[PDB]
Amino acid sequence: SKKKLRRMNRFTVAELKQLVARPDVVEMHDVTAQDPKLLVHLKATRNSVPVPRHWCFKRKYLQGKRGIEKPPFELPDFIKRTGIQEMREALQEKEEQKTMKSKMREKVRPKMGKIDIDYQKLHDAFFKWQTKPKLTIHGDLYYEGKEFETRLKEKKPGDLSDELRISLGMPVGPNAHKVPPPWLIAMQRYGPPPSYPNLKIPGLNSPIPESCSFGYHAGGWGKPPVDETGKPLYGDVFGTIDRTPWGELE
Amino acid sequence: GEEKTILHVKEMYDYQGRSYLHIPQDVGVNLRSTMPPEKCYLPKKQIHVWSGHTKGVSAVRLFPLSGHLLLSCSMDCKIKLWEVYGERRCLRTFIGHSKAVRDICFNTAGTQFL
Amino acid sequence: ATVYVGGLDEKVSEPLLWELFLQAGPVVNTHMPKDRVTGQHQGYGFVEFLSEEDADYAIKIMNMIKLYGKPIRVNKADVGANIFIGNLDPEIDEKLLYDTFSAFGVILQTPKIMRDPDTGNSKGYAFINFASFDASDAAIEAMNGQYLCNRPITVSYAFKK
Amino acid sequence: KRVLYVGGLAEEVDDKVLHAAFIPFGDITDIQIPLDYETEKHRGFAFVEFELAEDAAAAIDNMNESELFGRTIRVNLAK
Amino acid sequence: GHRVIVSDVQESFIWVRYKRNENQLIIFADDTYPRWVTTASLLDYDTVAGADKFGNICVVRLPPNTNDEVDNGASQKAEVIMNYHVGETVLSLQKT
Amino acid sequence: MGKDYIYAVTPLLEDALMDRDLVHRQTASAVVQHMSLGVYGFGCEDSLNHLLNYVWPNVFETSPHVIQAVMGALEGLRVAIGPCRMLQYCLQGLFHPARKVRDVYWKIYNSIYIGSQDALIAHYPRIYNDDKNTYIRYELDYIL
Amino acid sequence: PAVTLSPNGKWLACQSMDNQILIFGAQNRFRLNKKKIFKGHMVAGYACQVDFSPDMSYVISGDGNGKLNIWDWKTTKLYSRFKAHDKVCIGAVWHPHETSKVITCGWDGLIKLWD
């Protein structure tokens, strides 16, 4: 029939990826386009923004945000320190304790002007300490399950964590520099790994991190790995305008 | 109280026959300087935890001139001497107070403490 | 390359597993392909560090790391198949040890070198869990008195502590 | 079955004595002797790996309960 | 003094770096729009003003923290801080 | 005047655009619409970009009120954020494999086109020319 | 309950039980310097050691909440406040030669090095 003929009229995902000039894009959604050469040229244009994840899914948009426990909302700093938030928390706790009776009584013999609104505290929050939140630039749609996602493609060696340091035996904080991790030890001993030969280890193939210490006890840099003639294992394990804006308002 | 001292290091003397009071020179900062560092910075990370008192520490004292050793006293009736550099080990524990130790002071040379 | 994530912690997630793989070296694969029923961690995993010595030292490091608070070991992926090996060469590395002692069998525990703790330099003894007792036999035989790195080898069946 | 354990060795029995006393049964591949580093002496036992398992079996047959340094030693398959 | 702002004909301004000792020409930051530029100008070390064939003038600024030296189609990009439809093709800007 | 409280309010709308219910997302979308039409021309476009990221996923929806408030948010956001940004959001799904997605993207692009069809002339992509047609626009890349 | 001399011999940091560090001029008639009063920690009932950075850029003190408090000596502004100990932080000492190294001790029985 017509559907069967055009289904056979359709091609292989390898057909596509080899035809196309930019093969990163190809997916079976495109392989299922009634005009896949277009669809792929479009998806490979500059600056364009791909369809959301979730048209395939059977679950609706954030019904996946449903099941796990979710916290409510955390105010901006400049409003916590503006003393209308605390005002509102206090009034809340008051009226949650009071008995049905008392709410009707406050409506009647009212506590008129319990707390006068504070000015210049507010007006300075909103007009003197208001600040840019964290925004996400063009393209990065929010989808459900974003919090889960594993995070990868930091092939960099210097990438360390504080729990990583703790549960590996190394230091957390300003000493994450002057702390060569227990893997830089065998980096100095028999070399850094031969798929990160484009990685230099700090204190083992790189110079001293800020104010490092040479020595062979716990807490130092040891022998920066060098040849018998003096050249290090690699790199250097020891270590040897007018940006003013034009239109601006202070 | 019965006076007792526990050395926790196997070796009292280094490879030159010197005590652990000898100001180290393998430290990347000159601990014999009388001049302060040109500029200080605020600490950001916890580097080390000396664990080994069984009650709260009541005072801490650095070694005079050089700061390479640390004395601590505690409500556990013990005084402890620690390395600030190297492997940061407990070097010695002094025992002989019948009650909690409140304060401690080195002499100017650091050879003795009260 | 392939490392046995043993004592593989249940909730200790493969994401931070791979982040530690990177914080040690070539994070190329972190996988604990689990039970087809459970989903939780299956006690042994494959961690590929695409460099052999990278995985070797990363293993020496991430052993005793408190996974789920518990020490979990990165190793090679108990009726006494452990052999005592003394007059030991102190100048070896751990992956070099695994490749020098793994010729006649697997190593279910890398060579634990009985070194002094005051310094970090050994006095010349170790013990190594191989695959078989006949494996420890053959290896300890071919290296009985034979040429070790600087102090000639002397190997046989190991004592129990 | 080429490696055999030999115990009951007198303090003077050494690797050269063991090689000389076991060499008659066939070429030896290795000799390993546990020693106690605090004393510098052996623990009274050793392991001899001969090239041939048949030579090791003959040495076991001929050496078990034999005399070496005036005392009876034990010889057996090590594993 | 050592940065380049190339301005292609359709995509945008494209900030390019010359590392002399390795002697490389390497990209670090470009724009997020299409802009058929006719002429651009420099306002500072990080800010570039652009004209456009259709009427507009815009001012685009690099974020304040650019990893100048390193080694979709870019790594990190610039922002737009002003947008004006002049009304006629603007063929030359100048800071003066 | 909203140019002041736009920052204070964003993290609450992103909070309620990550699901809480149909009506939750319907209402946060209405709020985005009116913020955008107020802050037209005052530069608070990074914040409306951030909230586009969260509104655009609701594009595939069915309930009339919900999808309708979504479409309203996108017209407001079109004047306030410009029609490049929204043509880029609408690029890839014009010619996509499913007909539900083709239809929603052509609904949007129709409304983006009717209003402000004349900016887009400088926002269209570069679409190469095959054998028997000409598709590049050489008019636009004369040098001068 | 705690007093320390500053590295240059000119100032005494006296921790006062009213939640303030009071600065006295050590060489000059022992007068209180009303321009140098450090506030924003809580030390009521505790003998928390105060110390100075070697360069006199900073003043450090532990609090009853186990927090290390770090003020800029020049502006008197609290610059850093982090939880150092689980219990009361009693000892705070700056390392005399090192730019960032601070040693804290607490009633939790721990001593902590910071950098």
Curated annotation (Swiss-Prot), chain A:
Where does the secretion signal sit in this chain?
none
Q: Where in the cell is it found?
A: Nucleus; Nucleus speckle
Which lineage ranks, top first, belong to the organism behind this chain?
Eukaryota, Metazoa, Chordata, Craniata, Vertebrata
Briefly, what is this protein's role?
Component of the 17S U2 SnRNP complex of the spliceosome, a large ribonucleoprotein complex that removes introns from transcribed pre-mRNAs. The 17S U2 SnRNP complex (1) directly participates in early spliceosome assembly and (2) mediates recognition of the intron branch site during pre-mRNA splicing by promoting the selection of the pre-mRNA branch-site adenosine, the nucleophile for the first step of splicing.
What effect is documented for mutating residue 22 to K? Answer: Does not affect methylation by PRMT9
Gene that this polypeptide is encoded by = SF3B2
The linked condition is: Craniofacial microsomia 1: A form of craniofacial microsomia, a disorder characterized by a spectrum of craniofacial malformations ranging from isolated microtia with or without aural atresia to underdevelopment of the mandible, maxilla, orbit, facial soft tissue, and/or facial nerve. CFM1 is an autosomal dominant form characterized by mandibular hypoplasia, microtia, facial and preauricular skin tags, epibulbar dermoids, and lateral oral clefts. Affected individuals also present skeletal and cardiac abnormalities.
Record-given protein name: Splicing factor 3B subunit 2
Q: Where is this cross-link: Glycyl lysine isopeptide (Lys-Gly) (interchain with G-Cter in SUMO2)?
A: 43, 94
The full protein's residues present here are: 450 to 712 of 895
Swiss-Prot record, chain B:
What is its subcellular localisation?
Nucleus; Nucleus speckle
Which positions does the entry assign to WD repeats? 52-92
Superkingdom is: Eukaryota
What's the PTM story here?
The reaction is catalyzed by PPIL1.
Report the protein's function.
Required for pre-mRNA splicing as component of the activated spliceosome. Plays an important role in embryonic brain development; this function does not require proline isomerization.
Q: State the disease link.
A: Pontocerebellar hypoplasia 15: A form of pontocerebellar hypoplasia, a disorder characterized by structural defects of the pons and cerebellum, evident upon brain imaging. PCH15 is a severe autosomal recessive form characterized by progressive microcephaly, and poor or absent psychomotor development with severely impaired intellectual development apparent from birth. Other features may include spastic quadriplegia, early-onset seizures, and chronic anemia and thrombocytopenia.
The record's note on quaternary structure and interaction partners says:
Component of the pre-catalytic and catalytic spliceosome complexes. Component of the postcatalytic spliceosome P complex. Interacts with PPIL1; this interaction leads to CDC40 isomerization.
Protein name from the UniProt record: Pre-mRNA-processing factor 17
Q: Which gene encodes it?
A: CDC40
Shown portion of the complete protein runs from 235 to 348 of 579
From Swiss-Prot, chain D:
Q: What is the effect of changing residue 38 to A?
A: Slightly decreased affinity for KMT2A
Question: Which effect does the record note for changing residue 45 to A?
Answer: Strongly decreased affinity for KMT2A. Decreased affinity for RNA
The family classification in the record reads: Belongs to the cyclophilin-type PPIase family. PPIase E subfamily.
Q: In which tissues is it expressed?
A: Found in all the examined tissues including heart, brain, placenta, lung, liver, skeletal muscle, kidney and pancreas.
Complexes and interactors: Identified in the spliceosome C complex. Component of the XAB2 complex, a multimeric protein complex composed of XAB2, PRPF19, AQR, ZNF830, ISY1, and PPIE. Identified in a pentameric intron-binding (IB) complex composed of AQR, XAB2, ISY1, ZNF830 and PPIE that is incorporated into the spliceosome as a preassembled complex. The IB complex does not contain PRPF19. Interacts (via RNA-binding domain) with KMT2A (via the third PHD-type zinc-finger).
Q: What does this protein do?
A: Involved in pre-mRNA splicing as component of the spliceosome. Combines RNA-binding and PPIase activities. Binds mRNA and has a preference for single-stranded RNA molecules with poly-A and poly-U stretches, suggesting it binds to the poly(A)-region in the 3'-UTR of mRNA molecules. Catalyzes the cis-trans isomerization of proline imidic peptide bonds in proteins. Inhibits KMT2A activity; this requires proline isomerase activity.
Q: Which organism is it from?
A: Homo sapiens (Human)
The region annotated as signal peptide is none
Stretches assigned to the RRM domain: 2-79
Q: Which domain of life is it from?
A: Eukaryota
Where in or outside the cell? Nucleus
Name of the protein described by the UniProt record: Peptidyl-prolyl cis-trans isomerase E
UniProtKB/Swiss-Prot annotation, chain E:
User: Where is it located?
Assistant: Nucleus
Coiled coil located at which positions?
A: none
Q: Where is this region: Interaction with SF3B1?
A: 32-53
Give the function comment from the record: Component of the 17S U2 SnRNP complex of the spliceosome, a large ribonucleoprotein complex that removes introns from transcribed pre-mRNAs. The 17S U2 SnRNP complex (1) directly participates in early spliceosome assembly and (2) mediates recognition of the intron branch site during pre-mRNA splicing by promoting the selection of the pre-mRNA branch-site adenosine, the nucleophile for the first step of splicing.
How this chain assembles, per its entry, is: Component of the 17S U2 SnRNP complex, a ribonucleoprotein complex that contains small nuclear RNA (snRNA) U2 and a number of specific proteins. Part of the SF3B subcomplex of the 17S U2 SnRNP complex. SF3B associates with the splicing subcomplex SF3A and a 12S RNA unit to form the U2 small nuclear ribonucleoproteins complex (U2 snRNP). Within the SF3B subcomplex, interacts directly with SF3B1 (via HEAT domain), SF3B5 and PHF5A. Identified in the spliceosome A complex; remains associated with the spliceosome throughout the splicing process. Component of the spliceosome B complex.
State the family named in the UniProt similarity comment for this chain.
Answer: Belongs to the RSE1 family.
Q: How are the domains described in the entry?
A: The core of the protein consists of three beta-propeller domains.
What's the name of the protein? Splicing factor 3B subunit 3
